[PDB]
Tab-separated table of C-alpha atoms and ligand atoms in Angstrom:
chain	number	residue	atom	x	y	z
A	1	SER	CA	-4.893	13.086	-2.030
A	2	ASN	CA	-5.754	9.374	-2.075
A	3	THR	CA	-4.006	7.125	-4.539
A	4	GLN	CA	-5.772	4.976	-7.129
A	5	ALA	CA	-5.389	1.956	-4.868
A	6	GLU	CA	-6.810	3.754	-1.833
A	7	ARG	CA	-9.697	5.178	-3.909
A	8	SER	CA	-10.389	1.641	-5.171
A	9	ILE	CA	-10.668	0.266	-1.687
A	10	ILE	CA	-12.859	3.141	-0.481
A	11	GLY	CA	-15.015	2.624	-3.544
A	12	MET	CA	-15.639	-1.017	-2.498
A	13	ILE	CA	-16.906	0.120	0.919
A	14	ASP	CA	-19.142	2.710	-0.708
A	15	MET	CA	-20.432	0.027	-3.124
A	16	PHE	CA	-21.213	-2.335	-0.213
A	17	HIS	CA	-23.143	0.496	1.426
A	18	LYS	CA	-25.352	1.059	-1.691
A	19	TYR	CA	-26.848	-2.424	-1.110
A	20	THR	CA	-26.961	-3.124	2.682
A	21	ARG	CA	-30.163	-3.241	4.698
A	22	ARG	CA	-30.469	-1.745	8.190
A	23	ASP	CA	-28.588	-4.688	9.703
A	24	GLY	CA	-25.500	-3.750	7.675
A	25	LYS	CA	-25.807	-6.838	5.462
A	26	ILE	CA	-26.801	-7.527	1.892
A	27	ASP	CA	-29.815	-9.732	1.193
A	28	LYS	CA	-30.101	-12.051	-1.736
A	29	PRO	CA	-31.988	-9.935	-4.325
A	30	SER	CA	-29.734	-6.956	-3.467
A	31	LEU	CA	-26.586	-9.004	-3.965
A	32	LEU	CA	-27.771	-10.059	-7.430
A	33	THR	CA	-28.580	-6.440	-8.320
A	34	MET	CA	-25.159	-5.397	-7.085
A	35	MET	CA	-23.540	-7.973	-9.360
A	36	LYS	CA	-25.585	-7.001	-12.437
A	37	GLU	CA	-24.876	-3.313	-11.863
A	38	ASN	CA	-21.199	-3.512	-10.987
A	39	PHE	CA	-19.869	-6.665	-12.698
A	40	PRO	CA	-21.841	-6.930	-15.881
A	41	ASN	CA	-18.873	-7.719	-18.138
A	42	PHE	CA	-17.670	-10.273	-15.676
A	43	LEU	CA	-21.127	-11.875	-15.723
A	44	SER	CA	-21.281	-11.721	-19.558
A	45	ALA	CA	-17.982	-13.566	-19.860
A	46	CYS	CA	-19.358	-16.251	-17.530
A	47	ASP	CA	-22.516	-16.561	-19.649
A	48	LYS	CA	-20.534	-17.050	-22.846
A	49	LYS	CA	-18.772	-19.959	-21.070
A	50	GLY	CA	-22.184	-21.442	-20.171
A	51	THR	CA	-22.010	-20.418	-16.488
A	52	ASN	CA	-24.795	-18.489	-14.713
A	53	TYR	CA	-22.783	-16.968	-11.878
A	54	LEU	CA	-25.921	-15.608	-10.143
A	55	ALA	CA	-27.571	-19.047	-9.803
A	56	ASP	CA	-25.392	-20.029	-6.828
A	57	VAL	CA	-23.301	-16.995	-5.813
A	58	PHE	CA	-25.466	-16.243	-2.767
A	59	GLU	CA	-25.468	-19.798	-1.498
A	60	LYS	CA	-21.732	-20.129	-2.081
A	61	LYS	CA	-20.869	-16.920	-0.299
A	62	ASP	CA	-23.336	-17.068	2.611
A	63	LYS	CA	-20.783	-19.068	4.624
A	64	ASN	CA	-22.595	-18.871	7.955
A	65	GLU	CA	-26.038	-19.591	6.372
A	66	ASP	CA	-27.799	-16.617	7.937
A	67	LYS	CA	-29.366	-15.656	4.597
A	68	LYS	CA	-27.403	-12.416	4.520
A	69	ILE	CA	-24.009	-11.424	3.061
A	70	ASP	CA	-21.937	-9.556	5.637
A	71	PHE	CA	-18.858	-7.502	4.902
A	72	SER	CA	-16.459	-10.408	5.386
A	73	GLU	CA	-18.453	-12.548	2.947
A	74	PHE	CA	-18.566	-9.621	0.511
A	75	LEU	CA	-14.756	-9.412	0.652
A	76	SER	CA	-14.634	-13.183	-0.087
A	77	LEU	CA	-16.802	-12.601	-3.167
A	78	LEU	CA	-14.506	-9.789	-4.352
A	79	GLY	CA	-11.546	-12.155	-3.821
A	80	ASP	CA	-13.219	-14.771	-6.041
A	81	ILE	CA	-13.781	-12.189	-8.768
A	82	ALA	CA	-10.150	-10.969	-8.449
A	83	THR	CA	-8.879	-14.540	-8.581
A	84	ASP	CA	-10.746	-15.073	-11.877
A	85	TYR	CA	-9.258	-11.909	-13.346
A	86	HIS	CA	-5.862	-12.991	-12.097
A	87	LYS	CA	-6.212	-16.365	-13.811
A	88	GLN	CA	-7.242	-14.573	-17.034
A	89	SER	CA	-4.121	-12.422	-16.852
A	90	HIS	CA	-2.119	-15.726	-16.938
A	91	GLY	CA	-3.917	-16.898	-20.071
A	92	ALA	CA	-6.815	-18.854	-18.506
A	93	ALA	CA	-10.248	-18.535	-20.041
A	94	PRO	CA	-12.620	-16.192	-18.156
A	95	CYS	CA	-14.907	-17.593	-15.486
A	96	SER	CA	-12.830	-20.760	-15.119
B	1	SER	CA	-16.564	-0.863	-21.372
B	2	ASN	CA	-15.580	-2.032	-17.881
B	3	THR	CA	-17.310	-0.522	-14.895
B	4	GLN	CA	-15.535	1.259	-12.046
B	5	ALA	CA	-15.762	-1.892	-9.949
B	6	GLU	CA	-14.331	-4.103	-12.693
B	7	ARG	CA	-11.543	-1.575	-13.407
B	8	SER	CA	-10.763	-1.545	-9.669
B	9	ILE	CA	-10.354	-5.276	-9.548
B	10	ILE	CA	-8.233	-5.378	-12.712
B	11	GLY	CA	-6.134	-2.593	-11.251
B	12	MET	CA	-5.364	-4.774	-8.186
B	13	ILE	CA	-4.055	-7.570	-10.432
B	14	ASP	CA	-1.947	-5.096	-12.380
B	15	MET	CA	-0.625	-3.674	-9.074
B	16	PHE	CA	0.304	-7.179	-7.842
B	17	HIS	CA	2.176	-7.712	-11.105
B	18	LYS	CA	4.290	-4.514	-10.643
B	19	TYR	CA	5.916	-6.174	-7.592
B	20	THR	CA	6.143	-9.976	-8.206
B	21	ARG	CA	9.394	-11.807	-8.847
B	22	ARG	CA	9.732	-14.586	-11.434
B	23	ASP	CA	7.988	-17.058	-9.123
B	24	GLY	CA	4.822	-14.938	-9.255
B	25	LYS	CA	5.180	-13.875	-5.612
B	26	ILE	CA	6.112	-10.708	-3.790
B	27	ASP	CA	9.181	-10.686	-1.551
B	28	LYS	CA	9.475	-8.692	1.609
B	29	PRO	CA	11.228	-5.483	0.437
B	30	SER	CA	8.896	-5.372	-2.602
B	31	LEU	CA	5.807	-5.693	-0.431
B	32	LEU	CA	6.945	-2.742	1.695
B	33	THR	CA	7.610	-0.667	-1.435
B	34	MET	CA	4.187	-1.596	-2.750
B	35	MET	CA	2.601	-0.369	0.477
B	36	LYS	CA	4.539	2.922	0.543
B	37	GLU	CA	3.720	3.590	-3.105
B	38	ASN	CA	0.074	2.575	-3.124
B	39	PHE	CA	-1.190	3.089	0.450
B	40	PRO	CA	0.714	6.064	1.720
B	41	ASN	CA	-2.279	7.827	3.289
B	42	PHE	CA	-3.336	4.614	4.899
B	43	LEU	CA	0.171	4.239	6.341
B	44	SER	CA	0.228	7.908	7.478
B	45	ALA	CA	-3.013	7.465	9.394
B	46	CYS	CA	-1.493	4.419	11.111
B	47	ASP	CA	1.623	6.418	12.038
B	48	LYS	CA	-0.417	9.199	13.616
B	49	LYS	CA	-2.038	6.495	15.803
B	50	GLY	CA	1.443	5.268	16.818
B	51	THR	CA	1.322	2.135	14.623
B	52	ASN	CA	4.082	1.201	12.146
B	53	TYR	CA	2.088	-1.029	9.811
B	54	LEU	CA	5.219	-2.103	7.874
B	55	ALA	CA	6.990	-3.517	10.960
B	56	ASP	CA	4.917	-6.720	10.940
B	57	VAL	CA	2.750	-6.732	7.792
B	58	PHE	CA	4.960	-9.278	6.012
B	59	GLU	CA	5.112	-11.660	8.935
B	60	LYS	CA	1.377	-11.348	9.531
B	61	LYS	CA	0.448	-11.983	5.932
B	62	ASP	CA	2.988	-14.691	5.039
B	63	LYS	CA	0.552	-17.341	6.308
B	64	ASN	CA	2.435	-20.352	4.964
B	65	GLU	CA	5.862	-18.986	6.090
B	66	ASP	CA	7.558	-19.407	2.723
B	67	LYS	CA	9.012	-15.886	2.900
B	68	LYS	CA	6.940	-14.797	-0.080
B	69	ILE	CA	3.481	-13.206	-0.445
B	70	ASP	CA	1.409	-15.078	-3.018
B	71	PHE	CA	-1.754	-13.803	-4.633
B	72	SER	CA	-4.041	-15.310	-2.001
B	73	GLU	CA	-2.035	-13.661	0.784
B	74	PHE	CA	-2.079	-10.385	-1.160
B	75	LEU	CA	-5.889	-10.576	-1.313
B	76	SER	CA	-5.902	-11.144	2.490
B	77	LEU	CA	-3.828	-7.976	2.922
B	78	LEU	CA	-6.245	-5.996	0.724
B	79	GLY	CA	-9.110	-7.387	2.846
B	80	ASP	CA	-7.403	-6.114	6.014
B	81	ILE	CA	-6.993	-2.664	4.481
B	82	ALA	CA	-10.654	-2.679	3.312
B	83	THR	CA	-11.808	-3.791	6.750
B	84	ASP	CA	-10.003	-0.802	8.312
B	85	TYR	CA	-11.631	1.590	5.859
B	86	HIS	CA	-14.958	-0.063	6.540
B	87	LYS	CA	-14.535	0.436	10.284
B	88	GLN	CA	-13.643	4.106	9.651
B	89	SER	CA	-16.830	4.548	7.639
B	90	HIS	CA	-18.721	3.457	10.827
B	91	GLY	CA	-16.959	6.077	12.938
B	92	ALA	CA	-13.960	4.047	14.187
B	93	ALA	CA	-10.577	5.715	14.320
B	94	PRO	CA	-8.242	4.802	11.425
B	95	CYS	CA	-5.846	1.896	11.796
B	96	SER	CA	-7.807	0.422	14.705
C	101	CA	CA1	-23.918	-14.716	5.950
C	102	CA	CA1	3.569	-17.030	1.690
C	103	CL	CL1	-22.565	-1.966	7.049
C	104	CL	CL1	1.815	-13.850	-10.655
C	105	ZN	ZN1	-20.782	-0.775	6.828
C	106	ZN	ZN1	-0.011	-13.304	-11.661
């Protein structure tokens, strides 16, 4: 029986696999769809602050500039999102 | 209403906060406890392969050698765990 933490991690792999193309990477329109579908409250908190997270997320996370997001770059994105939530838990405003 | 993905991320912050000391970092015995409590099936799969993940995890993840695991180093650990699960989902053996 997996724990909540283990299920969470497995769920992130399964989420990545909803959006990959045949080359095992996520293209730009698919990454935006993934964000809208899985992080809509995160995105809404950004909006309220005047920030359109989807304007630049692909360009910021496509570190090797191959116009795809691979699993390592996907993990980096999740780490950015987690870092925002962590800042919020310390009293920061969202999407700072 | 948060989504499953957003709840997962928030859950990782709350998990980090179960184990921090006053300086907002996780010390070595606490990190091992966190692993045993939250990733026991992950650890058991390692064992079966002949790998004791807890022998070196602290030393591998304490990148700045301050004898604490801060949030950024905690995210790196989660990314290692996710990368293992991702490899498994592609047919690799666990804890490779
Ligand atoms: Ca890329
Ligand atoms: Ca450290
Ligand atoms: Cl893939
Ligand atoms: Cl903290
Ligand atoms: Zn994959
Ligand atoms: Zn904290």
